[PDB]
Each structure stands twice: as structure tokens, then as C-alpha cells.
Subunit: 333 residues, 5 copies
């Protein structure tokens, strides 16, 4: 679930339905299961999602998933929307669909995820259309992880007889390699590039981001009760003619099976030493407080698990108005 | 209960007091029971409802229910009311009454549900009259379902000193055939034709709707624990000289006995590939997000069960203000 | 408790401290107990109340009770108060007092309940005075029930230097006879007449109401777990030179011992076929939706029991701002 | 705790840290304990309080307590504060301190409580000073209770350079004698005389109240489950040249050990027959509804007990916004 | 955790991750653990914090901690911020880092805590820079405690082209000596000295504070369940040419293992006899109510512990809006 992965800091050691989309060999290690992210239709946060992963014989898995929206796509569209209130109708991805398949052939597991979305409102006063398509291919043997995420299409446009807007992807590539020395240690490198082009009612805009990350994650000698982990990552991010950040996030956390009905999840992070963002023009530096934490739970009823975030975590409260948020339901067959 | 059927995506595999009305042979399969939908008198959502089903012989069942309102009826009345604040007194069905009977004679079980409602307010500053009457007849032998739902009468009129308005069913027919190749699989076909004439203070309105549906719902090999299910339905709807939609809803869900006191219910759906509503005049297409989900619980105290929806399901939360809504109570003798 | 009798639809099969006032032989059948209705002093809904019933020998019972207000009295007083904001201080009964006694001679149990109240505020800007006095006499042998409720005095008057109002009872009789063919069935009939004169700042008013009720109540074989009941009653009410009503309420409900700590209560009722009120002046008829339900609970700690209503029953909701209302506390010795 | 004594209607039969201050022989009967009344610093209701009682030999006890304020002192200061917003800074007792000591010398237990308070704000725009001092001496032998409570100093004054105010005790004496015919019955009498003077920016005021109470309280035979009790008291109060009241409070209640973790407490009272207050000037009588109840719990964890009032009692609700108020914590060593 | 230390009156008898920073030998006595203080990034209260302590051989411990902010530093910044809204951006410490180490050398355990922080916003409209560095050195043999906390750097400054502001530490020294006659008694003394200089847009300011404290703290002979404690301390504080105070805080509390899943924490305090603050200029004295209390809880799931304050402690309530605040999560390996 999203709440689980978030409380676990999105760390690379985590195995989850939600991390498998972009690491599809993981679909082969997951238990057959159905999961539903609670939320609403349309422009809603959380947005309703859900799907399943099934085993097909001994050496492969497959499944489908409804409603998943790309982080990059939704960010771009929201930036346009926030630019001018006339762009309020610019679409997020409509009816997102994922298909995925994984197979273990001897010592290597490989997998593939396909992403497609498409929709339109041809009402003249709205006049919107959006499409996306992409793929993730990956393989692993326990020691080596190879992950490739490639966007094919990402476009959203608006034209209502008053204004016009559009935003489009001119390339999305995410490549990751991981090396696991032992079941407790992993090191990883990652390179990401996206090009986005927008036209807001005449005015063109471009954004090009390139980011390099090198990191390591450690876990403890496997406990039957507590997965404790810690990590360090160096992250270099260049927005063309905008800015450049060099960040050293240090993080740590735990997933603890605290009771027959309860999993507790918590983690904390801070950028240690390296926290600067520099302006390409002025060279002025922003270097501000970055300490952050996360907390959530799982309520276990055997095959049924209700995951959530502690809604009060950012304010330090557990109280009946601030209990669970980002709820998901997972049934493991 | 309503909340249970809704958390299970209204799938045809469900057997429930609330699914029995329009599939009256089901009344012969339910355990003798009394059920009450929490709510209020009058123009309230939820509206108070309640009834029972009792075994007559070893091969028949019968009972009565109070307060059921037709969905078609309430939609028509509410559309009219939304037309203009002058029509805010247009009545919904008053004092709904249902009687139903079911008998297993051979390998064929058959059943009948009669619905009637009638009310009026003759205060001159109000002056309103509403009536409805309908039947449902059905039979099944486990392999084949035949269900017919017939509207005989539906009329609501408003005549005060200032404005008039009326709305009236000119025919409501609903026919379903189902085939069960096994206990796990059903295919079903459904045809629905309805015509509605209304008068909004002189101006006349006419809406005619025909829909064709073909679908399949599968359940896993029956276990004492977790009823998982998925279905595919293709649905053509034609509103005369108005619009045409062709939708392919896909859904899955689970009913799990999570604890001796706890039933958990969840489901997710999306229109896959086919999601278009075309406007008749312009030919403009609407193709927008369809993802939706549902979550509910049953709290179990032996013969008493309290059913509910997770009120926070559309916003992803569970907390003191968003725990249980659409509550119902059922006593199984 | 009030919430218990309300959740059990006020049915005549109920034995409760709260149904005994107007059926005083019941005080012989109750267990020695002290009950308290949570509320406030003064013009508060709910109003603080409470009393006890104690055994004297094996053949008599007696007790006293504080705070009880007559339904008819408060209805009268509220009608006046609503007539105009200047009658806003017209009093309800002040410091209600009830005393009661019951004795079982041979096969007959008889009892009497005395009600008296009296209060005044002689502040010149308030200037109010209210008094009431009445009695209940009843006998029963298990098969026949004879109940007389007689009002002696009921007056409430207000005179500040600005306006005057007074309401006064000119007669209040209630006679009920019940017949029990078995412990599972009861038929009964009831005549009630009441006359009330009021003066609102000069305008005189008279209301005279006469009602006849014949009804039936059945329970299922006395069980040790679930007490299911249903009833039918036809009720004719005449308000002289105002209104006539003929109503056929049908109701049904359950009291279930759902756990060692929990009693669940629920009922639903509707006017079936007969639901008509006709203005005597115009002959205009009102015939509007009458479906209604009620839900409550008892939290059991051996000799302590906390009764309540599901505060969210009318909205279909159980959450943390809508849990228990109408709380009462009963200690059974 | 305050909530405990309050839920038991302040009955003379109760033994509690909070009743011992003015009945110091009780400090010898209490179990060594530490109690903390939850609250805030300053002009806060509830105000933080806390202290302890400790045994010395087998025949003596002593202890201290922080934060206690006199009801008469707070009544006086609040009345002045309410006379005029200019007097808003008039001080309640500051840093209240109690020392107490009890000893048993044969059949007689005796004890004394000393109360001191003192504080000032010499800021010229506040200019406040307040002081109090008093003693309680009492002795009991089981059959006979002698309690004397004597004020010594009671003064609060304000001089901010724009208005002056002061209020001052001219004598506070309160004498009680009780007789216990048995462990179940007590009759008691009480005389209280107080004289207060005040200056409200040059206007002088006096209040001499004198009161007589004779009462009786009964409990049932000692049972380790549910201590039931009732009482009646007649009380005559004369506020010299202002008002007179004659009041006959009748009350009953229960403390029930309802579970291993739960103590339930409830009581109801009403003035019966005698409920009159007469304004001395005009002779105008006020005689209004007096019914009132109270309810609380103890949550027990062996040596730890959290006491509270049911915050929803005056409105008859129990829900997660109206759960516990007037919380206190008590550790019995 | 902070809630734990606070509910325990911040007493010197408490051993906690939060009291070790300034008593680093304690890091040798703490069990290996990770802790997270729930909160947010940036100018937030509570502020996300967290870290760990780990053993390294049998005679040493080390670890690290993110997010901690000096109370003196935050006080200085906040006072400057309050002086003028033009200083709204004056930074608190950014990305606080703590490293600590401790070693048992025979009968002596010694430890060291290093604190460093640094951040900046070079946007010309913000123009802020902040830096801090400090050390704590301490050692103990179980009988003698020696603690030195020393501030090296402490500066925060703002220059946005419109206003300037800065605050700087010209010295921070904190020495404590403690003596333990037994495991139940401790006496201690403490001297603290600090000079802070500031410039608010050309207006200079200086604040030199010196304080002395001598205290005693006691616990009872160790139970396995209920740790009770009480202390007295006398504290003299002089702010050069501004103010002085002499205060005698007396206090008392308990940490009780109330259940396998619950720790209850409560204390209360008041300044007894000595409570005066003199204005150096006018010689005027302030001497106002000082009673205060604190209540918290630990929820225990074996190695996981969720600590909190009772959010409603200052108003005496436990309800669903006021349950737990200042939450922290601790995993003991
Ligand atoms: C417990 C002692 C830790 C000392 C760390 C000193 C490293 C200096 O690095 C600085 O880290 C901050 C963090 O953001 C940066 O802002 C500075 O530019 C660095 O020099
Ligand atoms: C990643 C799975 C690939 C599925 C691709 C299906 C191709 C077309 O998909 C549908 O196209 C229509 C056209 O509007 C959309 O409305 C549907 O939602 C799509 O599923
Ligand atoms: C399937 C049951 C049909 C039997 C009802 C026939 C006549 C009922 O008369 C009306 O009953 C309604 C309730 O639906 C009342 O509200 C009306 O007042 C009656 O006229
Ligand atoms: C339940 C019947 C018992 C009779 C009550 C005694 C009659 C006395 O009435 C009192 O009248 C005074 C005023 O004179 C009221 O203030 C009291 O509340 C009454 O009890
Ligand atoms: C509208 C322009 C914004 C940028 C859009 C980038 C392309 C988005 C499409 C994502 C496809 C790749 C995802 C692989 C599988 C998955 O993660 O679901
Ligand atoms: C105001 C009219 C609008 C159109 C509404 C037509 C529906 C009225 C007929 C009632 C249908 C009842 C079918 C019997 C079984 C059931 O209870 O569903
Ligand atoms: C304001 C005047 C309206 C008239 C109301 C009738 C007043 C009569 C009150 C006494 C009737 C109750 C006596 C029987 C015992 C009981 O029900 O407590
Ligand atoms: C402040 C203006 C006058 C108001 C009345 C003051 C009443 C006297 C206060 C002195 C304290 C008496 C309490 C001693 C009994 C005890 O030990 O609790
Ligand atoms: C800008 C305001 C100046 C405030 C001056 C006081 C802070 C300077 C010293 C930093 C704190 C060092 C604390 C060492 C041990 C610890 O508590 O972690
Ligand atoms: C198995 C857990 C025991 C009870 C824990 C309750 C936490 C609120
Ligand atoms: C069925 C074991 C206890 C479950 C408690 C869950 C409540 C959040
Ligand atoms: C089944 C052990 C106790 C569960 C406590 C649940 C508290 C929410
Ligand atoms: C009596 C077994 C536990 C039932 C718990 C229900 C609470 C929602
Ligand atoms: C016996 C387990 C019952 C737990 C109740 C859960 C409350 C929501
Ligand atoms: C199993 C002990 C009784 C539970 C009482 C709960 C009431 C809310
Ligand atoms: C199963 C023991 C009692 C559970 C009480 C549940 C009420 C929340
Ligand atoms: C193990 C503790 C018993 C239950 C305590 C419940 C308090 C609300
Ligand atoms: C029988 C164990 C305690 C039940 C506590 C329920 C509190 C709501
Ligand atoms: C598992 C023992 C009782 C738990 C009670 C929890 C109350 C919130």
C-alpha cells in the first residue's frame, strides 16, 4: 500500500505491490493478492485505485491495476492549473490502466509493466484531452537489479474557445542498477531524465531535469518480528537554467509486527551536510531545514490487512479526529 | 443490507434481503430474518426502512417491507425538483409497501414481489399526490435465472396556487436472464426500457431510455473464509434524441470473515476500453475517469449483525467523525 | 429506561420502570432497582430524572421518583410558548414528584401512582405559576389488564407587566383494558379524552381531543436470548372543530442479548393503508410518509446497566460524535 | 478526586482525599496515596492541584497539598469581578498550600488542616494583592463527629491607578456535629456563619450569611460490590436583608465496582416540599425546578485510578467529544 | 521521549534519550534503541526529530540524532521575531545534527555530545543565515555526576534589503554537580551563565543571565511497578539590569507500569514560600499562582512504545479531540 511504502521512506529494501510497478520482477516475489487504495473518482486525493497479482504456474505472475496516475504527469498538469485559473479543466490521466507480467527462468527473474491512460471531454466549453503510455522492464537475480522505466506518451491539452493550454512530455527515462552484497546490504545507482514542454495560451515553457543518485540501504539480520533499516543517498538534480541541488539524505526506520493485529511503521530522514540548492542565475543558495518523519500502521485480520498513515503524524497527535488516513485494503489469498 | 450490497459492487453473485426484491426466488434462500435500515421519516437520505422474511412451509417464504423507494421514481422526482425551487414539494413515494412470496415446487423456485405506495397533501399551498405500483416475478433452478420487473404506475403531481408540475412513468420493463455453468460462474443478459413524461408548469418533457447489458461474474471455489469475486459487463444505453453510452465496467471485490465479530467488504471498479458517452446532436464524446471503490463492514454478535459503510472511504480516512454510515441492523432468527 | 422503551417502539409487551407509572401493577413485577435519567435541571431536554422501586414483604412494592413531566402538560405548554416569543417563560411542571405502591392480593395485582408538581417565580418581570396533580390506578391477573390514568389538576399561568397567558386542563382521562390469550399474545383497547382551555393575552382557546385505539401485540416463544415482537393498532383521533385522523400503525422490533455486555434494540413502524388526517374545516386530507425506526443499546456490567439511543439512528450513522444519546443508568439490586 | 465526590452528591458518607480537608480525622482512614487534579495554572477551571497523604506510625498520618482554593473566597472574588469589567484582575488565592496531620489516640481520632495562600502583582497597572489563611480541627470516635472550620484571613484587593476594589472576610466559622447510630445511619447538624465586606471603587458592601442544616444519610449493609446510599437534609439560609431560603434536598446514589477496570458512580437529587427562596425586600418567592443528577467513572489499573465526570451527563450523551471531564489521577501506594 | 521527560517533571532521576544529550554518560546506560519525535519540517512545533544509540563493545556506546533545537537559541530567535513583523524570517537552527559517544572506564562512565547546525536562504528578499555549535562533556561513577554544557557558536541574522536583525551568543556555560548518597537520594547544584547580544535594525540589545540552583530529588525503594519521586529546588536567577527571581519549586510524580500495554505518568509542582520576581528598576515584585501538573502515557507493544502527553491535561478532559499529543515512537532492539 501507499501508506506502508511512505511510512517506510520509499526505501529500496521494501517489497510491496506499490513498488513493483517500477520493479516488475517484484510481482513474482509478492504473494497472490488483491489491493484497493481508498479514495474517490475524478480529481481527488486520494484517488480510488486497485488491482491484483496472480500466480500463473510455478514460474510466472501477472495482473492488472486500475486508476494509477504518474507522479510526473500529475505534477505537470497541476503546475499548469496553478499558473492560471482559466486552465482549471486541464486533465489528469483518465482511467489509468496497468498490465504486468513477471517470470523466473532459472536464476533470473524478469518482469514488465505497461501503463496506458486516455480520455477526453469534447464539450466545447471544456474541450480537453489526455493520453499517457509507458513501460517498465526489469530483471534481477538476487545480486543484480536492472530496472528501466521509459515513458512513451504524455500529453494533456485544453481548448475551450477562450484560452488554450497544453503540456507534453519530450522524453522520460529512469534507469536503476542495484548490487546486493548480502541479504542485508544493497547499493544502487539511478539516473533520471525528463523533458516537459508546455504552451499556456500562447506562452511556451520548457522544463528539463536530470538527476543522479547513488545510495545504500542496510537491514538487520532478519528478525521474525522487526525489519529495521537505514540508508544514505547522494542526489544531484539539475533543472536546466533553473537550479541545481546536491543532497545527502540520511534515513532510518522500522516495520515491527507489534501485535497479532498490529504492524507499526515509522521512519525519519534529514539531509546531512549536503543540503544546498543553487540558483543557476544568481548562484544564491537555499540551505534550509529538511528534517522529516513518517508514521503508519497495519491492522491485521489474517488474510485481511487495513494499512494507513497516522493522520496526525505531522502535528504529533493521535486523537479520534486525527487517526488513520491514506487507507488501503489488501487481501492476501 | 444496502451497505453490504453496495460494498460488494452490486454483483449478481450476492444473496441479500436487498437483492431479493427484484429476484424474489432469492426470498426462499434467505434465512428467516428481520432487517431495519437506519434513517429518518420523509425526505431523508437514508430513509427509514424495514421488513422481515419468514418460512411458511418447508418450500415457501413470504414477508413484508416498509419504506422502500424506487430508484427510478426518486431520480425523476429529484430531477424535476432541481429544475426549479417552485417544485421542491414534488413527492417521493410515500409509505412504500412491499409484499413478497416465494415457493420451491420442483427443482424450480419462483417468487413474486408486489410494491405499492400512495400519499397526498391537499393543503392548497402544497397540493401534491404521488402513487406507485409494480411487480417483480422470477424463477430459477440453479442453472437458469428468469427475472422480470414491471412498473404498473408511477406518478407524482404538484398543483398549488402558483405553479404546477407532474412526472409520470409511461412504462418500465426490466428483464434479466442468467445462466450458471457452475457455482463459480454466471453469465447474464439484461434489457431495460423505460419512458417518462413530465410537465414543468406547462413545458412538457419526455425521456425514453433503453439499455442492453451482457456480463459475467465469477467467484472462487467456495471457502468458509474469503469470497473473492470479479465481473465484466458491457452496457449500451440509448436516451432517445439525447445521448448514447457504451461502457465496459470491470470490477472485483471481497467479502471476508476477518474475525468472529468482523466482516470486511471492499471492491473496486473501472470502465476499461469502453467509456464513451456520445451526445446525439453534436456527436461530441465524453470520456472521463470511472475508477471507483467501496468499503464496508459487518459487526457480528451471533444472531445480530450491524452493517455499515466506511464513511471515510471516498477520502481515504478512518477516524471518529468518519467511521460508519449507511448503518443497518439485521436479526437472523 | 426511556431509551429502552423508545427503542422497543413503546410496545405494550415491555416491562420497564418507565412503563410502570401508567400501569402501576408493573411495579410489583419489576426488580428492586434505582434508575437515573441523565439530563439537566430546568428547561432541558433531556431532563434530569430518577427514582427507585423497593419490595415490602413478598406481596407489596413501593417507591418514589423525581423529575417526571407529563407529556400532555409539556405539549400544551410548548404549544402556547410557540404561539409567541412573549409567552417564552410559560412553565413546565416544576419539581415533579411521583409516589407509587403495588400489591398482589391473590391472583390480582393492583397498584397506584400519585403525581404532584408545583412551582412559581414571582419576579415581576417573569411572574409564573404552575401546578399539576394526577393519579394512575391499575389491576391485572395476568390475563386481564385494567388501567385508569386520571388528571386532577394541570395549570400554568404567566403574568408580567406586559402580557398574560394561561393554559389549564379541564379534564384528562385515559382508560385501557388488555386481554392476554397467552404469554405470547395480547389485545387491548384504549379511550382517551382531554380538554384544555388557554388564554393567550386575551384570546381564549379550547382544544378537546378524544381518541379510541384497538390493537394487538405478539411475541415469539419466550426465549432466553432474542425477544422479537410485532403489533398492529388502529387509532381514531378527533380534535373538535379541527381535525380527524384514522391511522393503522404496524410495528416490529427486537431486544437481543448480543453479548455478556451488550443488549441491542431496534424497531420499525409504518402506517399501513390507514394514514389519513382530514381538516374538519376544509375536508382537506394529509397522507404523508410515516416510516420510522429506532435503535438503542444497553451496556451491561452485572447490576449496573447504561441504556442509550444510537444518537445517529436518524442519519444512518455510528461515529464518535454520534454514539450514545438519551443515556440512563439503572442499578438493579 | 473532585469528580468522585461530586458524582456521590457530596454525601457525608464518602471518604475521599477531597472530603478530608475539612474533616481531618479522615486523613487517618485514607490509604497512603498521591493524587493530582488535572488542570491549568492561574484563573483556570479546573485548576491544577495535587498532594499526598502518608502514614507516620501505626497511629498517625500527615501530608501536604498544592493548589486548593476556597469556594467562599472564589465566590467573593468572582462576584466582584462580575460587578464591573474594571475589577477583572482581582486575584483568587495564589499558590494555595495545605498542611494536614491526623492522629488516633485510643478510640478517638483527631486531625487538623492548615490552609495558607499569598500573592501580589506590584505592576502599577495591575496592583493586586491577596492572602488567605484558615484552619480545620476535627475529631471522631466512630459514633461522634466534631468538625470545626475557621477562617483567619480572607482578603483580595486591587489598586491599578484607575479603580480600586477589595473584598475581605470578617469571620468564617462552620461547625458540624454528626451521630452514627450504626455503620449504615448518620444524622448530622451544621451551622455556618460568614460575614464579608467589600469596596467597589468607593461603594461599600456587606454580606452576612447564616445557615442551619440538619440531615441524615443512609447506606446499605457493607457489600464489596455496590455501595448504595440516600439522604435528606433541611437547610435554612438567611442572607441578612437580602434573601432567605428553606430547602429540603433529597438524594440517592450508587458507587458500583462494575468491572475489574471500572467504577461507576451516579446520583440524583431534588428539593421535595421545601424549595423556596424569598427576596427579603419584596417578599417575592422563587420556587423553580431543582431536579439534578451526576455521573462519573473510575478507570482502575490496580494502584492507578483515573477518575472523571461523564462530561455529557447534563445532555444525556456519551460520545467521543463528551467522554471524560474533571479528570484526576490517584496512585495508592 | 519528550512527553515522558515532561510528564516526569523533567526530574534529574529520569534516564531517557532526551536527558542524555546534556548528560552523555547516560548514553551508556540506555538500551540500544531508535526514537522518533513526531512532527513537521521547518518552523513547526512539534518539530520532526529522531535518532539512535548503539553499543560498541561492552564499555562504549555511540549514536546520532537529527532535528534537535536548542531552547536558548529558539528563545532568542523567537523574541527577536516578536519584536517586529519585519523579522518574521529570522531563522531557528537548521538541520540540527548531534553526535554522541560514551565509555565506561572502570567505575567511571564518561560521555560527550556534539551539537552542530547550519542553514541559509540567500534569496535577496529573505537573506538569512544561522549557525550553532556546542558540546556537553560529563562523567559519573554512580556517586558523583559532573556535567559541563558549553556553547561555542550561536548566531542567526537577517538582511533583506529593507531591515536587518541579528542575534548572537557571546557565551553559554552550564555546570552541574550531583551527589548520590544512595540509589534513592540525589542532591545537586547547577550554575548557568549566558550573554546574548542582538541588533534590531540599528537598535542594539544585550541580555546577560546568571542562575544558581541547589536541589534534591528522591525516589522510593525500587518497585518493579511504580516509580514514585519528589524533589525540592531553590533557584536564583538574575538578568543584569532587568530582573531577579528566587523560586522554591517543590514537585512530585509517579511513573507506573499500569498494564502490560500501559505506562501512566503524572506529576505536579508548585513554588512553595519562595516565588518572587523583582523588577530591577522599580523594585516591584510579582508573586502569582504557580501550580502546574503534567500527565502522559506510554502504549507498550514489546519492543515498540508510543509515548504521548494527555492533550487534555490542562483542561481536565480525556475525549476524542483531546487524547494524545507530543507523540513519539521508540523501538528498543
Ligand atoms: C555533531 C557534529 C557534526 C558536525 C558536522 C560538520 C560538517 C559541516 O557541514 C555543514 O553541514 C551543513 C548542513 O546543511 C551545511 O549547511 C554546511 O554548508 C556544511 O558546511
Ligand atoms: C497498459 C494496457 C494497455 C491497454 C491499451 C488499450 C488501448 C485503448 O485503450 C482504451 O482506449 C479508449 C479510447 O478512448 C479509452 O477511453 C479507454 O479508457 C482505454 O482503455
Ligand atoms: C402490495 C400492497 C398493496 C396493498 C395496498 C392497497 C391500498 C393501500 O392504500 C394505501 O396504503 C398506503 C401505504 O402504501 C397509504 O399511505 C394510503 O393512505 C392508502 O391509500
Ligand atoms: C406525589 C404527591 C405527594 C404530594 C406532595 C406534597 C405536597 C406539597 O407540595 C409542595 O408545595 C410547595 C410550595 O408550597 C412546593 O415548593 C413543593 O415543591 C411541593 O412539594
Ligand atoms: C503531461 C506531461 C507530463 C509528463 C508525463 C510523463 C509520462 C507519463 C506516463 C508514465 C508511463 C511509464 C510508467 C511505467 C509503469 C508505472 O509506473 O505505472
Ligand atoms: C414519478 C415516476 C417516475 C418513474 C418511476 C417508475 C417506477 C414506479 C413503479 C414501481 C416499481 C416497483 C417494482 C417492484 C419491485 C421493487 O420493489 O423493486
Ligand atoms: C398545561 C395543562 C395541560 C394538561 C396536562 C394534564 C396534567 C395532568 C398531570 C397528571 C397525570 C399523570 C399522573 C399519573 C402518573 C404519571 O404518569 O406520572
Ligand atoms: C477574599 C474575600 C473574602 C471571601 C471569603 C474568604 C473565606 C476565608 C478564606 C480563608 C481560608 C479558610 C479555609 C480553611 C479550611 C481548610 O483547611 O480547607
Ligand atoms: C541566535 C541566538 C543565540 C542562542 C545561543 C545559545 C545556543 C548556542 C549553543 C548551541 C547549543 C549547544 C548544546 C550542546 C548539547 C545539546 O543540548 O545538544
Ligand atoms: C495484544 C494487545 C493487548 C492490548 C493493547 C491495547 C492498546 C490500546
Ligand atoms: C481481533 C483481535 C483484536 C483486533 C482489534 C482491532 C481494533 C483496531
Ligand atoms: C485482542 C487484544 C486486544 C485488542 C485491543 C484493540 C484496541 C483498539
Ligand atoms: C464480544 C467480542 C468483541 C466484539 C467487539 C465489537 C466492537 C466493535
Ligand atoms: C475481542 C476483540 C474485540 C476488539 C474490539 C475492536 C474495537 C473497534
Ligand atoms: C469484556 C468487558 C466488558 C466490555 C465493556 C465495553 C463497554 C464500551
Ligand atoms: C470482547 C471484549 C469486549 C469488547 C468491547 C468492544 C467495545 C469497543
Ligand atoms: C488490561 C486493562 C483492562 C481494560 C482497560 C480499558 C480502559 C478503557
Ligand atoms: C476485559 C478486558 C477489558 C475490556 C475493556 C473495554 C474498554 C472499552
Ligand atoms: C488487552 C487488554 C485490554 C485492552 C483494552 C484497550 C482499551 C483501549
Amino acid at each position: 500500500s501507499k501508506a506502508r511504502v511512505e511510512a517506510l521512506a520509499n526505501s529500496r529494501h521494501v517489497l510491496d505491490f506499490q513498488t513493483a510497478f517500477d520493479r516488475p520482477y517484484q510481482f513474482m516475489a509478492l504473494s497472490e493478492q488483491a489491493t484497493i487504495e481508498w479514495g474517490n473518482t475524478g480529481d481527488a486525493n486520494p484517488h480510488a485505485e486497485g488491482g491484483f497479482v496472480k500466480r500463473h504456474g510455478d514460474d510466472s505472475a501477472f495482473g492488472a491495476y486500475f486508476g494509477r496516475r504518474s507522479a510526473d504527469f500529475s505534477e505537470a498538469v497541476q503546475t499548469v492549473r496553478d499558473a492560471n485559473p482559466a486552465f482549471a479543466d486541464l486533465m489528469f490521466e483518465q482511467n489509468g490502466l496497468n498490465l504486468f507480467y513477471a517470470s523466473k527462468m532459472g536464476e533470473w527473474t524478469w518482469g514488465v509493466t505497461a501503463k496506458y491512460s486516455n480520455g477526453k471531454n469534447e464539450d466545447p466549453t471544456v474541450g480537453t484531452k489526455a493520453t499517457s503510455a509507458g513501460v517498465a522492464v526489469a530483471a534481477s537475480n538476487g545480486t543484480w537489479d536492472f530496472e528501466l522505466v521509459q515513458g512513451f506518451t504524455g500529453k494533456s491539452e485544453l481548448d475551450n474557445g477562450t484560452v488554450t493550454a497544453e503540456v507534453e512530455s519530450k522524453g522520460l527515462t529512469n534507469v536503476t542498477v542495484g548490487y546486493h552484497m548480502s541479504p542485508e546490504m544493497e547499493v544502487y545507482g539511478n539516473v533520471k531524465m525528463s523533458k516537459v514542454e508546455a504552451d499556456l495560451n500562447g506562452t511556451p515553457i520548457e522544463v528539463e531535469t536530470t538527476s543522479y543518485k547513488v545510495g545504500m540501504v542496510n537491514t538487520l539480520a532478519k528478525s521474525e518480528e522487526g525489519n529495521f533499516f537505514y540508508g544514505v543517498e547522494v542526489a544531484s538534480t539539475k533543472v536546466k537554467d533553473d537550479s541545481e541541488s546536491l543532497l545527502l539524505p540520511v534515513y532510518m526506520g522500522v516495520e515491527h509486527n507489534a501485535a497479532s493485529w498490529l504492524v507499526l511503521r515509522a521512519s525519519v530522514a534529514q539531509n546531512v551536510i549536503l543540503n544546498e540548492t543553487k540558483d543557476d542565475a544568481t548562484g544564491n543558495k537555499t540551505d534550509e531545514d529538511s528534517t522529516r518523519m513518517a508514521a503508519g500502521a497495519g491492522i491485521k485480520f489474517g488474510k485481511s490487512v487495513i494499512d494507513a498513515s497516522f493522520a496526525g503524524s505531522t502535528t504529533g497527535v493521535i486523537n479520534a479526529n486525527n487517526l488513520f488516513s491514506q487507507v488501503a485494503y489488501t487481501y492476501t489469498f
